[PDB]
Design a protein around this ligand. Structure first.
Ligand SMILES: CC(C)(O)CCOc1cc(Cl)cc(-c2cc(-c3c[nH]c(=O)[nH]c3=O)cn(-c3cccnc3)c2=O)c1
Ligand SMILES: CC(C)(O)CCOc1cc(Cl)cc(-c2cc(-c3c[nH]c(=O)[nH]c3=O)cn(-c3cccnc3)c2=O)c1
Lengths: 297, 297
């Protein structure tokens, strides 16, 4: 019993974190086999930088990579989109089985926050519909990575910058930003966000699995009638694919997806009336259906 | 910016988790140097067991310890309070610098949930005033450990059982239960719980550090007048030691502890009136002052 915002065990990623210094700028890098990945803005000093120019002016010896108390030698350097790739002379002996994946909004992942190549903590978050994440990051955290584990680590996020609202923007491990953001200091704000409906429904199923039933009712709704209410409350539309994804949870609890939608409609219209669900006073949308099944099963 | 329920990086503990099987019972063990620690109820089959008797009847060969895909040989076995200590023939080469600590209620720690010796996820929780924890644990999780890191891992919790309310009870790593619980199936319920006042105040300071100020006011209260309101709302008394502990956060924000207490009093008396703090609709009490400073600094 119980339901917690649970991260993946971080050991396999801890063994990959390094420090990358370029001049007076230090941030984190990800060391896999004989390559170190880090945000390319480590080469900046930049309202509007030309990274091609900045990199032409660098030599391998301008890059100091530290793995623990050991200096790695840079033997090559290239740029892929917004990531710098530093070839080093020694392969990381702790490289896990891994792949790089670009996630869809609404998907969750674990973040290993690091400073100076040293992991500080681990937490769970979601890619918001507006392609920001609500992380916890201070100066020096750039290059910290987000990931899921399946013995295979799927890296999906590298941290690059904090937006003015205090939310966070970054890239896949090929250097492509999530969202419309660019790695320079200019006026860029997150778009308006929405709530991840399928995740809220997943979390209500988690609550039932854990004995919270007070929000259930005998009514059902049509997908169309539900999505009409969703839009009024700034929730993402629910698709038939979402319904199918919730299938296993609907079967384990015996509550049809469209029956749970009638619960969610009631909750949106009347609030909780002073009650809580899994210890929360608001509707939680950063657990995926997969997250529920993993933790409740 | 941002504030998240953050766990310690789990790698140093992952390397210590093993599987302990005794007959048809399998649970998790903690392998440090040449000893494996696990809950002694692994030797049970038990409304009222006599563990001294059950252990006399065992031999080393009745204990199957598996570290990954390798069998460790048990060469000795003893019982300390409610923990079994299994001496094995090979020292764990991944043993971190570590110590065993018994924490006070209100302190937080990271849990590495494991099944069959294999880590499943990591989350943060607190020792509640009634000496239970609100964890996330399924059958087979017994022997999962709680810990803090300082390069030294301080183990503070080993999981033993789930209570009927869905909360969790266990021991320090010397086998002494937190709280009045015993490791057998009998009628034992958690005592009435209370809210950890100093932690709620810590979390309000975190909110100010992150730009939530709407709950602040110009008033101050006396420690005595505050504790009068605390008791009415089932909050732990605030002591001068708590006030002193909050010193650094009070200094960084320039808000006197007793000024923040007047905020907390208002919040207890009038609620949030539909507003949120650090993304929560209720007052959070599972961050210590130390947790705030670590994450905000
Ligand atoms: C355009 C916009 C988005 O509106 C305003 C911000 O614009 C940028 C653009 C770029 Cl290209 C980098 C950064 C940035 C740089 C650094 C950094 C600089 N120099 C170092 O030695 N080390 C660092 O870690 C840190 N953090 C940051 C701060 C807090 C949380 N997360 C990230 C940053 O956010 C910001
Ligand atoms: C007296 C009281 C507290 O009121 C009722 C419960 O009483 C006990 C007493 C003891 Cl001594 C053990 C357990 C228990 C045993 C096991 C277990 C048994 N056999 C195995 O092969 N493996 C196991 O993992 C598991 N979980 C458990 C379940 C869910 C979450 N956390 C723990 C358990 O809670 C419960």
């Amino acid at each position: 019993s119980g339901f917690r915002k649970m991260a993946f065990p971080s050991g396999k990623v801890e063994g990959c974190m390094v420090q990358v210094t370029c001049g007076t700028t230090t941030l984190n890098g990800l060391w896999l086999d004989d390559v170190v990945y880090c945000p390319r803005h480590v080469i900046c000093t930049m309202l509007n930088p030309n990274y091609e120019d900045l990199l032409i002016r660098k030599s391998n010896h301008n890059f100091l990579v530290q793995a623990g108390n050991v200096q790695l030698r840079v033997i090559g350097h290239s740029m892929q989109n917004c990531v710098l790739k530093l070839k080093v002379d020694t392969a990381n002996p702790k490289t896990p089985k891994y792949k790089f994946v670009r996630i869809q909004p609404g998907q969750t992942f674990s973040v290993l926050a690091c400073y100076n190549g040293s992991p500080s903590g681990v937490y769970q978050c979601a890619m918001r519909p507006n392609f920001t994440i609500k992380g916890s990051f201070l100066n020096g955290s750039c290059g910290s990575v987000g990931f899921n584990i399946d013995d295979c680590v799927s890296f999906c996020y590298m941290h690059h910058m904090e937006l003015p609202t205090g939310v966070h923007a970054g890239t896949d491990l090929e250097g492509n930003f999530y969202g419309p953001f660019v790695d320079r200091q200019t006026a860029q704000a997150a778009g308006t966000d929405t709530t991840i409906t399928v995740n809220v429904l997943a979390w209500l199923y988690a609550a039932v699995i854990n004995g919270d039933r007070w929000f259930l009712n005998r009514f059902t709704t049509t997908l169309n009638d539900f999505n009409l209410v969703a839009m009024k409350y700034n929730y993402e539309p629910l698709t038939q694919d979402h319904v199918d994804i919730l299938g296993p949870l609907s079967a384990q609890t015996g509550i049809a997806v469209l029956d749970m939608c009638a619960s969610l409609k009631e909750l949106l219209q009347n609030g909780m009336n002073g009650r809580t669900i899994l210890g929360s006073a608001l509707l939680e949308d950063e657990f995926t259906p997969f997250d529920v099944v993993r933790q409740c099963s």
